[PDB]
């Protein structure tokens with residue numbers, strides 16, 4: 001169980017198979033991927049040593065995406081899918097683009113980061129939403145940090161035009177809900193991959209993002225005053241048979257050597273303590 005409101009009892013499959021296999025991918029930071037621009041300053045034709053929240057080059061992502069249609073399996077809402085959120089996580093999210101009746105769509109999972117996922121605590125939610133405006137599909141990231149009454153078995157659904165067996169049910173809250181943060185951010189519905197840094201330091205939750213290139217850029221922060229402990233990528237139920245990828249690898253406080261080109265772009269990165277050559281390279285400015 002994720003949150004502890006019994007929101008639904010419709011098409012829940014509690015009988016227990018094996019635990020699903022989670023696909024893996026090797027972390028490669030060489031072209032800048034996994035790094036973010038420094039918000040307070042732009043760098044040009046230079047290379048910089050700094051401390052940040054970075055993944056371990058050479059370790060793995062896990063594809064945390066769960067695609068469904070009608071049946072929600074209870075296994076989806078436990079480890080290894082409910083996972084630990086310590087220092088932070090770096091996300092590599094495929095923008096699944098499926099074509100139906102002349103229209104290309106934009107679908108990928110939503111993620112919640114929280115402690116207990118009870119309405120006595122604050123949970124972060126990053127949920128995509130698309131809407132048809134002037135016969136052209138636009139995309140938003142709906143970002144909020146609230147005292148959500150999260151559900152046991154939280155899911156999202158795809159665009160109605162792709163059809164749905166299920167309603168969307170990841171929290172249940174009729175009244176007013178206290179929110180530390182809420183705003184929407186647009187994203188390019190034509191992007192192949194979206195990239196996310198989520199981390200926490202000194203009671204503050206941070207977030208970075210990009211839908212262009214491989215190097216993220218500051219999205220928001222908010223002071224929570226508490227420590228978050230878990231993340232859950234929610235299953236996305238839909239009638240289209242589509243392929244979802246939500247690759248997550250942990251961040252830790254590390255030292256990276258980043259190279260900035262003439263346009264201010266991070267085009268190369270080195271994880272200093274990852275391998276022996278990276279150690280030496282960082283030790284030679």
Ligand SMILES: *[C@@H]1O[C@H](CO)[C@@H](O[C@@H]2O[C@H](CO)[C@@H](O)[C@H](O)[C@H]2NC(C)=O)[C@H](O)[C@H]1NC(C)=O
Nearest residue numbers: 004005006118119120148149150172173174175
């Ligand atoms: C805050 O969360 C709880 C759920 O954890 C909400 O509802 C009650 O919770 C208790 C214990 O979990 C259950 O035994 C009750 O059955 C729940 N109520 C109902 C009507 O089912 C509680 O209402 C939430 N508060 C707000 C303001 O959303």
Ligand SMILES: *[C@@H]1O[C@H](CO)[C@@H](O[C@@H]2O[C@H](CO)[C@@H](O)[C@H](O)[C@H]2NC(C)=O)[C@H](O)[C@H]1NC(C)=O
Nearest residue numbers: 129130131140141142143144181182183184185
């Ligand atoms: C973030 O975007 C969503 C989607 O555009 C906004 O939700 C809509 O708001 C209108 C008016 O408040 C409602 O009548 C619609 O039903 C909402 N759409 C859905 C799908 O729920 C939301 O208000 C935006 N929030 C912020 C803070 O910008």
Ligand SMILES: *[C@@H]1O[C@H](CO)[C@@H](O)[C@H](O)[C@H]1NC(C)=O
Nearest residue numbers: 044045046260261262263264
């Ligand atoms: C580095 O940056 C400057 C900034 O104008 C640019 O003109 C120059 O061509 C770049 N390349 C080198 C090798 O300095």
